[PDB]
């Protein structure tokens, strides 16, 4: 009569454990490299009812795993092409005055240097055009010369974002919530599990999310401790706001041989007019989008508070300005026009003066760098604005008329907007159940 | 009547059903512990090896563990060992058909090593008795 124990194998059990995931890409490049195993186009998602699960946003190891993973890919892709050691020679530079707009006066600097040719016993005089943010007076030298010299982006391996699928190994499962009211952390009564996550674009930005996955129904303000101004506030929109970015210059590329089987590509001679790069966003759409953000944001703060917006709080160019990698050419853009408004309780575009910096310093690891060769002709961009990464200003008195500014810029936050749903769990098949068992003794 | 509580509820599907109804779904759970990486440089080379070895090692630890207990080769097996009733003073109907398995393991997780500490002793004791009858 007294109950005994029984051994149960495979019964569903979950334990919070995190390990190394795996990559899968859809049918050379820098992300996939045709190395990740292809994922079958039947992402069988299964809904688990009568269950609730806990999700810890900002503590998920998937965010950390992806951050370290792509950096390894970046280093892997940069090794096999020419280094730019011999480009640190003295630069005798001059201004550009041929059909120059007043807004960009002195930006480009026509330069000449005695960089060596393929033969070790011969030199050559080569002239190239460099942006003001790539040279420094000593007459000029490259910005990165006193720092470790960097390679040149292998011309062929484009950095165009490609969706990447993350799949856990056998014996592990990935759970994703589905409630449309999901906060940063808390139980979700619509838990589901899938072996592989949807396409995640690793596209980069610092202020405005580009080509992100939009929210389901309403704008969501996902944030941990909110009364603390020291941590960023992540906002995800619900309807995309189209953004246009273009480079008006008709640039041309010149190939210069540096050594045996090692070539370097320079800029110029430019053709046509000299116009500043600019990005465009609809005025009507942005005002509506901001109005919706404050409406939801006002549910977490005082209703009578006068919400204000302002540009960044200054600092280095890397974090002070919006960044993206459209068309393989980097843009640093001043977004003071997208936050110049005030909201009280109860024409088709914006001109954003952009900037370009061919010499690129990647993640704040200071020992690395890379070169971005130019691309012939004009470059056009069409992307979607899906959210913002704002920061809370301190010194507020009595919590009235609160304001936020764009900031942050850490690459982890960008993926957090895509990996907040997904968490990794471990399967504990073994188990013991009490019942009335009598083993058949031999 | 094609809809019966069975495998097609999905891998981990029984986690939302009662413990009694989850017994028939224990075969869909053992199948998804090895496969999934059948089809196939440092990055993703060592990672694939590390993941594959860990998955193989994890499954083996359970197979070995069931081997010592003598329940290996039987998905649902039980020994003759009794258990201290103080762990859970509940009836069979009060365990299987009225509560999910997920929260059950949490309550008894304290005595997982203790309950394991009786299974192998009995199995070896059973073998010794068989040895006595054998001799």
């Amino acid at each position, epitope marked *: 009569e007294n109950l005994w124990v029984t051994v149960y194998y495979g019964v569903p059990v979950w334990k919070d454990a995190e390990t190394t995931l795996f990559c899968a890409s859809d049918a050379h490049n820098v992300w996939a490299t045709h190395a990740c195993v292809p994922t079958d186009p039947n992402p069988q*998602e*299964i809904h688990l*009812e009568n269950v609730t699960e806990e999700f810890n946003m900002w503590k998920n190891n998937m965010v950390e795993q992806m951050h370290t993973d792509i950096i390894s890919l970046w280093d892997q892709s940069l090794k096999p092409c020419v280094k730019l050691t011999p480009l640190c020679v003295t630069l005798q530079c001059t201004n550009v005055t041929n059909n120059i707009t007043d807004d960009m006066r002195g930006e480009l600097k026509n330069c000449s240097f005695n960089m060596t040719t393929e033969l070790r016993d011969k030199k050559q005089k080569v002239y190239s055009l460099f942006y003001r943010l790539d040279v420094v007076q000593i007459e000029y030298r490259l910005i990165n010369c006193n720092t470790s010299a960097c390679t040149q982006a292998c011309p062929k391996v484009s950095f165009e974002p490609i969706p990447i699928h993350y799949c856990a190994p056998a014996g592990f499962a990935i759970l994703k919530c589905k409630d449309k009211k999901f906060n940063g952390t808390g139980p979700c009564p619509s838990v589901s599990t899938v072996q592989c996550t949807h396409g995640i674009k690793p596209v980069v930005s610092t202020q405005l999310l580009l080509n992100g996955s939009l929210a389901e129904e309403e704008v969501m303000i996902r944030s941990e401790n909110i009364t603390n101004n020291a941590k960023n506030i992540l906002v995800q929109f619900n309807t995309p706001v189209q953004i246009n970015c273009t480079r008006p210059n008709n640039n041309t590329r010149k190939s210069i041989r540096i050594g045996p089987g090692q070539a370097f590509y320079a800029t110029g001679d430019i053709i046509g007019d000299i116009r500043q790069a600019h990005c465009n966003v609809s005025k009507a759409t942005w005002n509506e989008t901001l109005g919706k953000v404050v409406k939801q944001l006002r549910k977490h703060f005082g209703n009578n508070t006068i919400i204000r917006f302002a540009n960044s709080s200054g600092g280095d160019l890397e974090v002070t300005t919006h960044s993206f990698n459209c068309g393989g050419e980097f843009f640093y853009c001043n977004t003071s026009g997208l936050f110049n408004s005030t909201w009280i309780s109860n024409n088709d575009s914006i001109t954003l003066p952009c900037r370009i910096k061919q010499i690129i310093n990647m993640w704040q690891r200071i020992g690395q760098c890379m070169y971005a060769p130019p691309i012939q002709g004009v470059i056009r961009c069409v992307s979607n604005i899906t959210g913002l990464i704002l920061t809370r200003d301190g010194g507020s008195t009595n919590s009235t008329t609160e304001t936020f500014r764009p900031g942050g810029g850490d690459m982890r936050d960008n993926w957090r907007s895509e990996l907040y749903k997904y968490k990794v769990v471990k399967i504990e098949p073994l188990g013991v159940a009490p019942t009335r068992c009598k083993r058949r003794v031999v | 009547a*094609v*809809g019966i*509580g*069975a495998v*097609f*509820l*999905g891998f981990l599907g029984a986690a939302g059903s009662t413990m009694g109804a989850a017994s028939m779904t224990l075969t869909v759970q053992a199948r998804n512990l090895l496969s999934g990486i059948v089809q196939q440089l440092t990055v993703w080379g060592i990672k694939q090896l590390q993941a594959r070895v860990l998955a193989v090692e994890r499954y083996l630890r359970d197979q070995q563990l069931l081997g010592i207990w003598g329940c290996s080769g039987k998905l649902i097996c039980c020994t003759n060992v009794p258990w201290n009733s103080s762990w859970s003073n509940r009836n069979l109907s009060e365990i299987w058909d009225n509560m999910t398995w997920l929260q059950w393991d949490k309550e008894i997780s304290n005595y997982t090593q203790i309950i394991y500490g009786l299974l192998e002793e009995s199995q070896n004791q059973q073998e010794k008795n068989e040895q006595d009858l054998l001799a």
Partner: nanobody
Amino acid sequence: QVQLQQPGAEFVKPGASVRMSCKASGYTFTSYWIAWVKQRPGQGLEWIGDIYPGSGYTNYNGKFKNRATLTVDTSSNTAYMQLSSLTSEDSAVYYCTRGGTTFVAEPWLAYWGQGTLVAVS
């Protein structure tokens, strides 16, 4: 009310494909079974297939040799069916009917919709 919205009618061409949708509203779509039924005017009702808007498990009729691919969406509460590439004699109306729970399964064929006229020509 438990309703299964269906498209009115689709006119397709030989060698083409169709996206036979079936909207779910007024109930929980993650539990009830979903099955398709043929209503040829000159012939009796025929069993087409069954999809579980759950685990994603799919079952197909013996006479179909897996000619169709069944897909569901738990986010938008919708169900989809591929033919795939049917022919002229199979031009009739298909009904997306809601089934019972995987456990009880007694309320099968509880509710229907209006169907969609598939006329490949």
